[PDB]
Amino acid sequence: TMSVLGHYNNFFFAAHLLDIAMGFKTLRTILSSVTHNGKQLVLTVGLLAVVVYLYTVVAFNFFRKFYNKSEDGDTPDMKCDDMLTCYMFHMYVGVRAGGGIGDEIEDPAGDEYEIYRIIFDITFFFFVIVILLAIIQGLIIDAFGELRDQQEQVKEDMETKCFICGIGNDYFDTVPHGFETHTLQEHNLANYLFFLMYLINKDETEHTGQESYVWKMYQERCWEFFPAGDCFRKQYEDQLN
Amino acid sequence: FWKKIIAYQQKLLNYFARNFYNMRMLALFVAFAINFILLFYKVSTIAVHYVLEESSGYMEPTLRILAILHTVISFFCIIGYYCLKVPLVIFKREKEVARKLEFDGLYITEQPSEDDIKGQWDRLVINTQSFPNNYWDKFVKRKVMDKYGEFYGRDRISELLGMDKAALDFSDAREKKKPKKDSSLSAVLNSIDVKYQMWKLGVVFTDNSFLYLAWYMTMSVLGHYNNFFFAAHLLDIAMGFKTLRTILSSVTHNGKQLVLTVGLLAVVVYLYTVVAFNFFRKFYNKSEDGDTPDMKCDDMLTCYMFHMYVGVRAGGGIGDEIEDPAGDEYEIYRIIFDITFFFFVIVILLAIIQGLIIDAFGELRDQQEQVKEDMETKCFICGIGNDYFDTVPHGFETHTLQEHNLANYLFFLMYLINKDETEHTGQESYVWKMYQERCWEFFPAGDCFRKQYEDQLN
Amino acid sequence: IFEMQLAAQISESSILTVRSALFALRYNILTLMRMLSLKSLKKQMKKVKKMTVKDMVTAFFSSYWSIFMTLLHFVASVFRGFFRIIC
Ligand SMILES: Nc1ncnc2c1ncn2[C@@H]1O[C@H](COP(=O)(O)OP(=O)(O)OP(=O)(O)O)[C@@H](O)[C@H]1O
Ligand SMILES: Nc1ncnc2c1ncn2[C@@H]1O[C@H](COP(=O)(O)OP(=O)(O)OP(=O)(O)O)[C@@H](O)[C@H]1O
Ligand SMILES: [Zn+2]
Ligand SMILES: [Zn+2]
Numbered sequence: 001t002m003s004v005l006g007h008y009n010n011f012f013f014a015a016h017l018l019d020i021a022m023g024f025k026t027l028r029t030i031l032s033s034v035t036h037n038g039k040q041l042v043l044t045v046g047l048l049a050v051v052v053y054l055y056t057v058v059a060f061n062f063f064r065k066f067y068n069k070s071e072d073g074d075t076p077d078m079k080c081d082d083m084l085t086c087y088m089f090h091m092y093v094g095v096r097a098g099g100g101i102g103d104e105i106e107d108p109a110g111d112e113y114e115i116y117r118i119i120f121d122i123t124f125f126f127f128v129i130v131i132l133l134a135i136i137q138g139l140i141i142d143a144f145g146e147l148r149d150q151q152e153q154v155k156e157d158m159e160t161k162c163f164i165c166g167i168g169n170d171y172f173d174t175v176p177h178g179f180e181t182h183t184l185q186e187h188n189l190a191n192y193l194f195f196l197m198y199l200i201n202k203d204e205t206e207h208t209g210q211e212s213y214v215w216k217m218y219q220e221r222c223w224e225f226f227p228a229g230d231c232f233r234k235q236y237e238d239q240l241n
Numbered sequence: 242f243w244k245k246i247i248a249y250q251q252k253l254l255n256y257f258a259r260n261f262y263n264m265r266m267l268a269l270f271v272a273f274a275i276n277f278i279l280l281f282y283k284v285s286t287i288a289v290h291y292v293l294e295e296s297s298g299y300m301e302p303t304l305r306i307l308a309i310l311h312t313v314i315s316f317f318c319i320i321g322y323y324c325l326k327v328p329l330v331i332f333k334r335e336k337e338v339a340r341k342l343e344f345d346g347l348y349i350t351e352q353p354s355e356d357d358i359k360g361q362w363d364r365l366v367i368n369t370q371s372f373p374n375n376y377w378d379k380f381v382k383r384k385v386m387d388k389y390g391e392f393y394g395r396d397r398i399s400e401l402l403g404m405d406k407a408a409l410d411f412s413d414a415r416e417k418k419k420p421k422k423d424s425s426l427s428a429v430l431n432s433i434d435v436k437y438q439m440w441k442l443g444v445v446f447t448d449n450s451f452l453y454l455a456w457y458m459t460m461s462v463l464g465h466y467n468n469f470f471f472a473a474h475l476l477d478i479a480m481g482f483k484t485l486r487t488i489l490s491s492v493t494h495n496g497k498q499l500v501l502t503v504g505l506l507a508v509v510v511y512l513y514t515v516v517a518f519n520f521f522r523k524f525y526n527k528s529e530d531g532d533t534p535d536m537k538c539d540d541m542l543t544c545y546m547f548h549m550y551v552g553v554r555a556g557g558g559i560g561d562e563i564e565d566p567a568g569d570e571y572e573i574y575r576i577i578f579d580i581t582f583f584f585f586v587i588v589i590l591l592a593i594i595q596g597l598i599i600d601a602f603g604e605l606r607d608q609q610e611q612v613k614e615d616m617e618t619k620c621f622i623c624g625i626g627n628d629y630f631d632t633v634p635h636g637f638e639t640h641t642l643q644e645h646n647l648a649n650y651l652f653f654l655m656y657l658i659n660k661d662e663t664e665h666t667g668q669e670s671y672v673w674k675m676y677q678e679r680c681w682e683f684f685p686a687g688d689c690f691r692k693q694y695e696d697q698l699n
Numbered sequence: 700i701f702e703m704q705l706a707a708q709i710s711e712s713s714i715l716t717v718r719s720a721l722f723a724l725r726y727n728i729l730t731l732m733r734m735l736s737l738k739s740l741k742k743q744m745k746k747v748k749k750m751t752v753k754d755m756v757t758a759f760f761s762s763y764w765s766i767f768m769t770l771l772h773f774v775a776s777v778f779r780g781f782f783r784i785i786c
Contacts, residue, residue: 040484040488043482043484043485043488047488050475053472054475054476057469057472060284061469064284081283081284082282082283082284082294083280083281083282084280087280098554098555100554118550121550122549122554125553125554126503130591130594131492134594134598134599135488137595137598137599138595138599138601138602141599142599142602142606145603145606149610224634229632229633229634229636249755250755250759253756316760319767320760323763355717356714357717358717358720362724426738426741430740435732435736438732439728439729442728442731443724443728446724446769446770447724452770452774455767455770458767
């Protein structure tokens with residue numbers, strides 16, 4: 001549909017640049033760094049909105065006169081004479097300001113509320129600019145770390161335990177290359193997939209006894225034929241070794 | 242008649258206890274609606290007046306109705322939680338004080354440290370005739386008598402626990418009892434334990450959650466005098482939503498370190514202020530017109546406020562806001578001053594704050610992962626590893642869901658507590674005796690049915 | 700061991716706040732129960748002797764309102780005492 005609309009307006013073809021996310025695997029790690037904690041990011045933005053609303057309420061009730069944003073005294077431009085305008089001013093200017101709302105509202109020196117407005121500005125800068133943005137950065141960094149840890153856990157589990165029976169690698173490693181031989185020749189998940197394909201494509205009337213047994217339990221969805229904590233080596237340990 | 246008014250009061254109590262949480266949610270929703278309405282609240286200018294500016298014109302009555310509803314819901318959210326969570330708090334404290342009497346001699350051999358509010362307040366409930374009102378152990382006084390009377394004196398320990406000496410013996414000799422009717426006047430007044438209710442009210446007042454609910458109700462009441470006090474109820478999202486609490490724990494996990502970092506920043510900025518006041522005073526003129534100078538560092542306090550308030554918030558530090566040093570004799574010194582301020586304050590200390598938050602995230606994640614790994618690799622009761630049970634297929638799952646289930650242990654404790662002592666079997670009596678003695682040797686530790694009958698079972 | 704021996708050689712031979720809080724608790728709860736532990740309750744209940752679910756619910760709410768007011772008085776007394784011991 002966007003490609004069709006691109007003929008009516010050539011700039012609708014820019015919407016197809018969003019396809020890089022769904023086309024490149026490498027970009028998806030970077031994007032998972034953001035989408036891994038997306039719910040927490042949204043909740044952090046909501047918490048920031050609530051905190052800025054509280055600051056807006058305080059400013060509208062006590063610090064209205066400092067919100068004149070007009071250089072000419074002939075016509076004042078009061079940005080916090082209304083709740084909605086004052087909240088928009090805060091959310092749109094104070095958040096983007098490096099030092100907070102105090103970077104953009106009038107200087108408090110010489111006023112009776114100087115200490116109160118200094119506390120206002122310092123607390124706004126600390127809680128909004130410093131901490132909540134730090135929460136966002138930490139969410140992204142923690143997503144990176146969590147994804148890396150998950151990949152490492154997958155690698156360690158696959159290298160230390162058999163996927164089918166779950167026996168540790170050391171028992172097989174008692175024999176040299178034992179774990180590799182067991183996981184590539186005896187308990188290969190690819191071999192199990194091939195066996196399932198072979199059973200499915202084979203005629204039921206031509207099944208052997210073992211094939212019929214496995215086929216019956218497969219149709220019943222009973223997975224007791226998969227070895228679990230046992231193997232050929234374990235059961236014939238005396239005779240084989 | 243009184244037996245019916247009690248039933249109706251109990252029905253109301255049960256209703257509020259059931260609906261405590263739903264109504265906390267309702268209070269949060271009403272607060273959000275009130276604040277959304279307040280977003281359309283302007284000032285009219287003489288004394289300025291606050292007025293709603295809306296084309297529809299009917300959200301003034303809507304706001305009034307919502308404020309009344311919020312106050313009512315807050316009162317009901319006190320009545321609920323009084324019907325629901327106060328009994329649990331009372332039960333916990335009664336259990337704690339009873340076990341400190343029995344197993345520690347708190348008010349017999351130890352005495353409170355005189356600075357513990359809980360320990361000093363709990364002295365009232367000992368003498369009450371209804372001490373273990375919520376706690377199940379109704380024989381704690383008799384057990385304390387048995388344990389401590391032979392050394393600290395029958396009569397004195399009985400005075401401490403508020404028990405009667407000769408009345409029991411006289412009643413045993415001759416019952417001498419007359420009937421009483423609770424419907425008569427002053428019957429309920431005589432039945433109610435004044436001292437026990439005193440102690441209970443003290444505990445409730447000292448409870449933190451009840452104090453928070455009382456503050457919520459007070460703010461809701463003040464919201465009628467000024468509608469902007471309803472904005473204070475938006476802080477309830479932290480205590481209402483579980484999901485926000487992970488984000489907030491990212492901050493509160495290292496809160497002490499954050500406060501100490503702020504203090505260290507204050508000290509460093511004070512040192513910079515001392516240096517500037519002693520050497521770089523002339524660079525702190527913040528007036529565009531040369532007719533009237535505005536010197537910000539001619540005083541220690543003003544110079545320190547200027548630093549803490551402007552240099553910290555400045556992107557490049559104090560040098561962004563003080564006079565250019567080029568052409569001065571102290572140019573190199575002030576360049577070093579500005580660069581070091583930017584590096585130590587703007588770059589490093591703020592980085593310390595960011596790192597504290599990130600490390601809190603990582604530490605919480607690691608703690609959750611540790612909990613998961615421990616629960617999946619070891620049995621909660623016996624502590625034997627999962628591999629031993631996994632020698633049998635699904636062995637760990639079977640052992641942890643059928644043999645050593647902590648839910649099953651909780652159910653067994655409930656069964657023993659609710660079962661009559663005279664009807665206990667031998668095993669039940671054994672476990673009950675060790676439970677009353679608080680000896681936990683009946684919990685398997687490093688052993689199990691499979692381990693002990695390994696030869697016969699397999 | 701050396702520092703332990705040296706320490707042995709050289710070694711040779713809140714309450715106001717908690718008390719004020721306890722007093723505030725006792726005083727406020729006594730004031731609360733002085734209006735619920737007297738025999739005038741009969742002359743107040745003579746009017747509510749009729750069933751009147753509305754009046755029963757009103758009294759039920761009023762009891763908890765009285766408890767809440769007692770807590771408010773207790774908190775105020777705690778603040779007063781804490782400021783007094785500051786000064
Ligand atoms: N039942 C199992 N079947 C197969 N591999 C297993 C099994 N249990 C454990 N493993 C381990 O899982 C790993 C499989 O390697 P892996 O699949 O990464 O390699 P590959 O077949 O060359 O292809 P690719 O790297 O593209 O996936 C090996 O280290 C192997 O020992
Ligand atoms: N003594 C034990 N009792 C119960 N579970 C145990 C015990 N020892 C270890 N576990 C493990 O703890 C986990 C309990 O799972 P969990 O409590 O998360 O699930 P649930 O009962 O479905 O409910 P929920 O996920 O809501 O807590 C299982 O993995 C179980 O093997
Ligand atoms: Zn295997
Ligand atoms: Zn176990």
